[PDB]
Structure 1
Amino acid sequence: QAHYDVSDDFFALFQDPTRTYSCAYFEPPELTLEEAQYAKVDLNLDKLDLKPGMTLLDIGCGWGTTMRRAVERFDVNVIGLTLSKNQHARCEQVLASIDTNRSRQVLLQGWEDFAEPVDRIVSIEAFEHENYDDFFKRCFNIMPADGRMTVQSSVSYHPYEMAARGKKLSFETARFIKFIVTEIFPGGRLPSTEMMVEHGEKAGFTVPEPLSLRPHYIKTLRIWGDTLQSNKDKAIEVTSEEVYNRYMKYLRGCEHYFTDEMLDCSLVTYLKPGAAA
């Protein structure tokens, strides 16, 4: 598995300047990838009913862009969880950089080890963060009566659903998912939307209809792919041709199966019983 670790410098050769490793939101459609990454952060935060002085938890806080945007836009305290030491170090500096009185904290740890009261939770494609019942129970229990959470995740369809598009394409898609979860996100899993919704419900949350981000991911993946390609030699020099090919397969293949409607990406909102109208 640790054969599949790639240095941060490689990702830098395909991602926008914020280093955001998740679906962008092209509204309006003319946004650059970077602007669209801020637009995706806003799309998530604007769902959360955030008010000054509240504490936002960011599960998989990445390079800290979401937390910074939350502090600046909503005048909230933030706590981020990441399992990356590089990310942790960057987040601390990103947040110390902010001119604010608000509390800002980043913890090198998973959500399993998190049990502090917070007001709202955001989690954007946190692939490093079986455990689903425990996750949603924890998120429910650490929030107040009006708590809300968003989780954005790439998703797969159950094999049953996949078979309805015909066997040829269902076996092909299952193999490719196996590739994502072996070589790109080792030990990862792609839940389905229905899993995301029904685990949230079992935990007591109200779950409105998930937002599909599929066409936005097609665009993100196209830009990422053309960009990595544009940097072939520089990428190859930084890792190997092996790592370059793997990521082109990933990027192009995802764009393909998203376009064919065999993968999706859902932004699911979870509302506690007392959430504001």
Structure 2
Amino acid sequence: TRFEDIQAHYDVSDDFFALFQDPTRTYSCAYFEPPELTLEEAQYAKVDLNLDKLDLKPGMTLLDIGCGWGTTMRRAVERFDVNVIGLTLSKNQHARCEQVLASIDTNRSRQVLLQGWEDFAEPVDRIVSIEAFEHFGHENYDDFFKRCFNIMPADGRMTVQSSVSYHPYEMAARGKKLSFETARFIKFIVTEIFPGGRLPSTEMMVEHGEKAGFTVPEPLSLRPHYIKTLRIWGDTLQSNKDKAIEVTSEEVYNRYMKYLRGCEHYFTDEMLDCSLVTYLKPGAAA
């Protein structure tokens, strides 16, 4: 009701995001390995970083939870010769993914579903989830990891890439001034950028996975890559200010410059992180 309306206020057209993102319209941390990659190349490098952890063999089925514009699923079909299932809650992303997957020269099964993981109960081999706020941004971590564990075979693996904060206790350790300042900035992100969202901690991502029965090796920090990503997003949005304002408003432009510049700052000050966590079932190949 009211809340919904107050949140709907912060809905932004896909056309605005196109004015700061790379041509793939990837809205997640890029991977600058090597460091000289373009943003677009680094976004393909991040997809590869995720898929290369999943022990994908031809004829397997990969589930993409929050499949975005279909880039991850397409790369998986092309590189690994796998079937793919994507989950998205965006009608626009659903339509684009169906066309992206239909375009692929393959006999492998390609399916895109307009639903959450809560309503998904089909057997799959491997799972990838890259900064899926619509799926991994509303708690019920115990149900999420239990679902992922139960739909995979004995050798199942999953990657989840997510922005993270620290427990208030850990934040206090690194300055009380900076601790409050960060907590107020997180409140802005979860009010105006990802309304109703909840930023997990790495410790939560690890411990909820372990409780479900997964082996969880040391998470990969993407912090330095997200600083680079947010710098390019900010610099690109600023270079398109007139076009961005015309498509939305000066309010929305200022909101996203605050978000992009702000995240770069709190990432640089090591008050935010980005974790790529691998979840291994007990029977996962060594």
TM-score by length of 2: 0.96
> For 2:248 and 2:63, how far apart are their aligned partners in 1?
34
1:65 CA drift (Å)? 0.1
> For 2:181 and 2:139, how far apart are their aligned partners in 1?
25
Q: Could you tell me which residue of structure 1 aligns to residue 214 of structure 2?
A: 205
| 1:142-196 deviation per Cα after TM superposition (whole angstroms, max 9, x unaligned) | 0000000000000000000000011000000000000000100001110000000
> For 2:253 and 2:82, how far apart are their aligned partners in 1?
40
- Determine which of 62, 68, 79 is the counterpart of 2:68: 62
> For 2:157 and 2:216, how far apart are their aligned partners in 1?
10
> For 2:139 and 2:190, how far apart are their aligned partners in 1?
15
Q: Could you tell me which residue of structure 1 aligns to residue 26 of structure 2?
A: 20
- Whether the aligned pair in 1 keeps the contact of 2:86 and 2:113 (CA below 8 Å) is yes
Structure 1 ranges of 4+ moved more than 3 A:
none
1:130 CA drift (Å)? 3.5
Matched position secondary structure for 1:144: coil
Matched position secondary structure for 2:170: helix
Matched position secondary structure for 1:149: strand
> For 2:212 and 2:163, how far apart are their aligned partners in 1?
21
Matched position secondary structure for 1:245: helix
> For 1:267 and 1:190, how far apart are their aligned partners in 2?
14
> For 2:192 and 2:44, how far apart are their aligned partners in 1?
28
1:227 CA drift (Å)? 0.2
| 1:228-248 deviation per Cα after TM superposition (whole angstroms, max 9, x unaligned) | 000000000000000000000
| 1:88-142 deviation per Cα after TM superposition (whole angstroms, max 9, x unaligned) | 0000000000000000000000000000000000000000173100000000000
CA RMSD between the two structures? 0.5
> For 2:109 and 2:139, how far apart are their aligned partners in 1?
33
Does residue 102 of structure 2 align to residue 96 of structure 1?
Answer: yes
Q: Could you tell me which residue of structure 2 aligns to residue 219 of structure 1?
A: 228
> For 2:279 and 2:64, how far apart are their aligned partners in 1?
15
> For 1:136 and 1:3, how far apart are their aligned partners in 2?
32
| 1:8-32 deviation per Cα after TM superposition (whole angstroms, max 9, x unaligned) | 0000000000000000000000000
Question: How many residues of Structure 1 are paired with residues of Structure 2 in the alignment?
Answer: 277
> For 2:161 and 2:74, how far apart are their aligned partners in 1?
18
1:68 CA drift (Å)? 0.1
Matched position secondary structure for 1:38: helix
> For 1:188 and 1:75, how far apart are their aligned partners in 2?
35
> For 1:239 and 1:43, how far apart are their aligned partners in 2?
34
> For 1:111 and 1:177, how far apart are their aligned partners in 2?
25
Of the structure 1 ranges 197-206 and 129-138, higher mean CA displacement relative to structure 2 is found in 129-138
> For 1:127 and 1:241, how far apart are their aligned partners in 2?
25
Matches within 5 A, 1:23-172: 23-128=29-134, 130-172=139-181
Change (3 A) 1:50 1:257: same
> For 2:116 and 2:139, how far apart are their aligned partners in 1?
15
- Whether the aligned pair in 1 keeps the contact of 2:139 and 2:198 (CA below 8 Å) is no
1:38 CA drift (Å)? 0.1
> For 1:217 and 1:207, how far apart are their aligned partners in 2?
22
> For 1:179 and 1:117, how far apart are their aligned partners in 2?
38
Matched position secondary structure for 2:133: coil
> For 2:11 and 2:153, how far apart are their aligned partners in 1?
38
Matched position secondary structure for 2:162: strand
| 1:57-99 deviation per Cα after TM superposition (whole angstroms, max 9, x unaligned) | 0000000000000000000000000000000000000000000
Identity over aligned pairs, percent: 100
